[PDB]
Design a protein around this ligand. Sequence first.
Ligand SMILES: Nc1ncnc2c1ncn2[C@@H]1O[C@H](COP(=O)(O)OP(=O)(O)OP(O)(O)=S)[C@@H](O)[C@H]1O
Ligand SMILES: [Mg+2]
Lengths: 1171, 276, 86, 92
Amino acid sequence: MNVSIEEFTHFDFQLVPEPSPLDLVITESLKNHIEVNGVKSGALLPLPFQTGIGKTYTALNFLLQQMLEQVRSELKEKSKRLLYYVTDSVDNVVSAKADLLKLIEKQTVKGEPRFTLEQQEYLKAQIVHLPNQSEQLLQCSDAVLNDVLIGFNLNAERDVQAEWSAISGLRRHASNPEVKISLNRQAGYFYRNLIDRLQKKQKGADRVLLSGSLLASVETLLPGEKIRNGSAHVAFLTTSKFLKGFHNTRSRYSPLRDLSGAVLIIDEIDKQNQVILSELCKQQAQDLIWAIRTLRANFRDHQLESSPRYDKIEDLFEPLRERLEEFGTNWNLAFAFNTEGANLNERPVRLFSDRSFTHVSSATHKLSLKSDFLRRKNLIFSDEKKHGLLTRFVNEADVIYQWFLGTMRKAVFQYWENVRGLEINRSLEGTFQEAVQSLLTHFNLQEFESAVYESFDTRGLRQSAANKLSSSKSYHHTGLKLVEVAHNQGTRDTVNCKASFLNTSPSGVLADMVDAGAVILGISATARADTVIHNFDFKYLNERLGNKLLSLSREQKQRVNNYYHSRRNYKDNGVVLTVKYLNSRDAFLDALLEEYKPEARSSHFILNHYLGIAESEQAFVRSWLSKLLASIKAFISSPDNRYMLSLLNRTLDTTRQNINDFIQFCCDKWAKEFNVKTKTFFGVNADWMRLVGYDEISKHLNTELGKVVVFSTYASMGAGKNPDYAVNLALEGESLISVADVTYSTQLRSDIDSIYLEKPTQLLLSDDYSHTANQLCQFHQILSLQENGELSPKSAENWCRQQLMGMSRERSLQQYHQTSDYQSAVRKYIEQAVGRAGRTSLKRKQILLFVDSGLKEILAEESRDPSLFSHEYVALVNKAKSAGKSIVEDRAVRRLFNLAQRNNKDGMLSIKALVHRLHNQPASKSDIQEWQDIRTQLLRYPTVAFQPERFNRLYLQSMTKGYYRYQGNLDGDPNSFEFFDRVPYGDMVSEEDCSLATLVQNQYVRPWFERKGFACSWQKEANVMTPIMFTNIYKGALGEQAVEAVLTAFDFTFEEVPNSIYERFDNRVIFAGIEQPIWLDSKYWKHEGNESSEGYSSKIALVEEEFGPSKFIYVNALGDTSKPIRYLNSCFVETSPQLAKVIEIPALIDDSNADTNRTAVQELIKWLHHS
Amino acid sequence: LYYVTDSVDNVVSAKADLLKLIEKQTVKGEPRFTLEQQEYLKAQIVHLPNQSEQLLQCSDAVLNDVLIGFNLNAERDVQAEWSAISGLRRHASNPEVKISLNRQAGYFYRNLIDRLQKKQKGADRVLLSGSLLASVETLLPGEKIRNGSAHVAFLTTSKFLKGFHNTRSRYSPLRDLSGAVLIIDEIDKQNQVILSELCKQQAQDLIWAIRTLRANFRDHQLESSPRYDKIEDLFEPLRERLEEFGTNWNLAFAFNTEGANLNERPVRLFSDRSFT
Amino acid sequence: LTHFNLQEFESAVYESFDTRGLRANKLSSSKSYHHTGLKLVEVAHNQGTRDTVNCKASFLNTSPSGVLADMVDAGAVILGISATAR
Amino acid sequence: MGMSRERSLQQYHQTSDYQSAVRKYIEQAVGRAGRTSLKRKQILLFVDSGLKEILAEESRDPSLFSHEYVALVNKAKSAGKSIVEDRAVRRL
DNA sequence: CTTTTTTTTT
DNA sequence: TTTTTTTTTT
Ligand SMILES: Nc1ncnc2c1ncn2[C@@H]1O[C@H](COP(=O)(O)OP(=O)(O)OP(O)(O)=S)[C@@H](O)[C@H]1O
Ligand SMILES: [Mg+2]
């Protein structure tokens, strides 16, 4: 029945249901965001309220109001606004879709249904659900497939009909449960093939016309075709499906490329952190040697067409072409690569790079790389003792590869700009595939076609342009890299460098999603958990998004708290939560095992033989099983409780059926002991929940009389399930009591009445996809813990080194158990799991909570504001705290110590790399500007009031307000630095040792400092410079500026130093029309210059060779004015003034009274006249 | 020694006829071969069917022995695939199930042999003997040829042109034909079979291939080791030809058409390469 | 192929060896269709782009009789059994 | 240009290659009744009549044929001889 | 105007 | 020394 919008004309769009406080929480924040940041701006709104308060019901009412607003827009009149509902589990997707359909059906306004049957049918026609391809194929009938095959003329093909006949035959005898497996696999492969040929047919000139039955059948087979043609604009799907996209008749639609204006509702947003991570680690490794040799070979000559379509694109690739020419010249890319020597063949070389300051190599010795022109080979060898290291080559090749992928993204966007004007309503995603194909075909780089596509998929969300001390630096938009250097397959004389990259973290992906223009509603009670492993980094998201990260006011949070406490009034309704912490108590499991099999020798024999548990793992099974039994008995002993849920870490499916039999035996015994009927539901997982619905449990409690025990896990029943059941008053005595103060629900429902919470175990994420994926996931978690501040840079480097050498998973878990991130993840899991018993307002008078005693200390360490917790979590925390006493340790000061060490180490490594790039002549403009920007910034802002977002790595947060203490070798190990209170007799970073006030009392320095805008005082701001920037940059700029100011008053002219002699001397001096060039090397004060006459004489030799004879000035800005002015030759030997090429001045401004050394300047001027 | 014919039925009938000849051949009223001689001679003959048929005739004990002996059990999807295959085996219904079982048996056999070979080529080479050797020789009949246990093969022309598998790689019998004896039965019908294999070759984009050859032969060099002796002199004329062709035809640019009768239908050219 | 950076021809090299693991057009050599073959080239627009073409070429480098003669030249002794062998 | 399979088959039917292929298939198929030395006293062969003219043009040496194929040829040839062009002169 | 089945890997 | 399940394409 074709439903139009003509039946919504008489609909009254201004009559809306009563807005709850949660509805005003979403609406007021979104209307303020629109009225402030603009209509086209994206936003991220986390909603971290109590479990079971009504956040998903409010998100589905918000989705229904968006659908009604869109219908009104089409009535008044454009393309459809896309609404997505995303969560990590399939069960929550289908439950939310059925809840929205129930909302449309059963919503009544003032005693009458809101929507007529035709309005309901249209609204339901606007919602789609996008499952995996096996579920999409298996859920549509044989008539639909035969209609599609006939309409598209595909039964003529032989392979297609053979595969479809096999599918229909296998699915006919689908009663057996092992046919269902290997039917999903073939359904997915057939769906791939059929959609590939359907799209190939639909893209050519022989494009079929779709209407009537063929259209309805292809919209049934391809739900994304409904979205493509504008029939639907609401989609329900999982996070992994959202990250992979779906299919329409034309191509595969990626929602991440078309997020401008979309609305995303991400339920349990924190658990999506790991899901996105699991996708980022699935990327394919690339051979960097082949990739760079191919890029260099195909960029020598190939040219784009001179067409208006390719306007402005050829200028994007010119810098990459010059870079490739110089890289291939420097590293001799005409030859291939092989290793040389011993110990390089037993195990391949593995290299790990943070890409900023963490570099770990598996080689014992630093590996070099030399070119043998006689052998025509590049040899990776180990030396016996510059620009010949393997790490340098690998880092530059990774930079060039990422530069190529970034310039491909820029050229695709420029192509879309040119073709929009040439084609004069085609989207950036519509033309993306044509742009990539045309560019790669023109450059003969079609082998990168896959690499470019996945590049758009992940960090392709990055419309970027960076790893400079002038940008905002973070691990989350930088990533990591793991390179394996091993021999090629088959060959025994060449090696490859297989590199795996993470170009962004999940928090980077979310931030780029908000920057794309999406409005994202993050719904979870743990949306602001203080972990970076099991949640996003919200300190990074706050710093990056700014005011696009919408916040809720104190009044709104008070209204929500009043809303929650007015519907969950436990204290006034006589409801008691009884918490019990259970130990192993093995003296009871031994008796239970004895009564299970009286004929056996002892319980060790029963466990080893009857239950099938090995001797090594018996003790663990002895501890977790007995705790479970101690909870079951206490539930059975309770006369009034009916519903129990036991959340474990492992599924009790048929694989552990022997243990299930033991558990079933024990339950039957207790059923006999108390004369209560009990039913146990084993193996309640995702597959069970899709095959056998959870309503069966709800059916049992509705009809049968007795108790029910459910055995599920955290991974299946811990985040968003509503496990309530319909209440039959005849099956419940005087036990249920309503705890809300004004009834708010139709139908009587009650929730879980007893719960057993095991301690979550495998809290450090893993990846079973491959070995590379698990390596990337482990290095991502170490770098996230170092970037947040939970790990010292020394401990993070030691953990990255043990990870590169192949540490065991138990050692990793032991290292992660030592952080506070682990405790915040444990409390997050406990709070979410305990929130499954708080869904309804019909409560039992007593609710039994049985908790693993291994959680007792952890729950005792909870110290957040208790104004946001649920009642059960407050009961758990109060019980744990009242049980004993714990020593509370501070977490912000350890983070400040770690982040001071981190910032100092990053500044050290970046400064050394930048100076090394400066010393390699010629020096590019970018490096010169970067050096000047650092010196300018540190001169203008030695301290900053707020946390910087441009030079963040130049500053650290200090305990004190304008100074701090430190200890460390500034030319040694950056991992051995100490700060603040750990060193009470260390050095200082302040104004007192600067002598800045002493320096600026000079009559000529002060006007220069005032004109330039340089600070003459250190503002007492908590963000102060790092010791590296204090000593190697700031004081050098202070001395150079003071010397230049003093000399410029004496008619001295200064020029920029040529790029080939940069960083060698401060400035170039021209005075009194002297044709002899003068070179200036200015220092702040005397200190200690370790450069002996060797390095200085080498510098003089280099400058004299470049520019002939010249004079030199070795001047110190500050010092004693009574000291003599000395004359030295190029060999630093004292001689007569007339035969000395270098004159050294001890000082230019006095330090004891701040008086300019006029005599020394006069003598220098006179000697210059003599020169 | 190879026995080749077009049809599978003639292969199995000729193998059973040779085995019957070994069994009941007589010389002057007494059997020619004792039972142990007969068992040795029969052990020298193998039959190489398609991969789905090779896998579907291996019992569950043989395949679990192979998976255990190569540490292939704990490798995720492989066990997922194998668990599915054995399930389809147990409930083999009417041919509706059987077409699917054959397709998945062939795909699983290809994957399993690919990983067995990549394991045998690396430094973690498993030692094969006893039960493990007998099981892998049952799963891979060409492993018997590679070892030297057997030297008589019965197979079809399609299998002979495709080759078979051992633990190391895929053995192509056409590359090692020196000194072999081939018995091709119904040789005339093999004319069409070989033809149907020659037409299966994959098309090549000539513009991409020549632009790649020109880009990569410009500067890249072989090593100056003894193992590459006088190989670069084989490629020098091809490099000079490539540089001259690229200069003449302006291979720095890409190619496009223009005008009528060129867009509506693609252009097809046929060449005998001599005069047609 | 690794030394020349032409690993994208690896499949092409393997199949060519498959067809020609047993081994000119000059009026001075023996000429025949059975050792030279034929070629069919299709010139069409590249898939996805509207401004470049490709020349997809399919070759037959030998006939079945050329394959059989190459087999005998490689050193195989072949017994051809059929009533219609000639 | 894209001719139809029936137009290829029409063009191939005009060659003597087609007739040697037809007679090769017939002789091989008829050779399936000559496997043993225990024979029925009468053997019945029923051949499509649209084959008789083809079988009428056998000209090879009959010393290599089987008995059933010799009888098939003699029966088709019983209508006599039809004028045909020498294959060697046209091949020349 | 002519009028299909066959093997193998995928 | 710690002690798993989940989604999607292939
Ligand atoms: N008028 C109503 N207002 C609020 N909730 C309602 C209302 N009517 C029914 N509900 C149900 O109230 C229960 C509360 O569950 P949700 O609203 O799904 O929970 P939640 O607050 O989102 O907690 P999460 O998702 O587990 S962290 C659900 O069963 C809702 O479907
Ligand atoms: Mg929810």
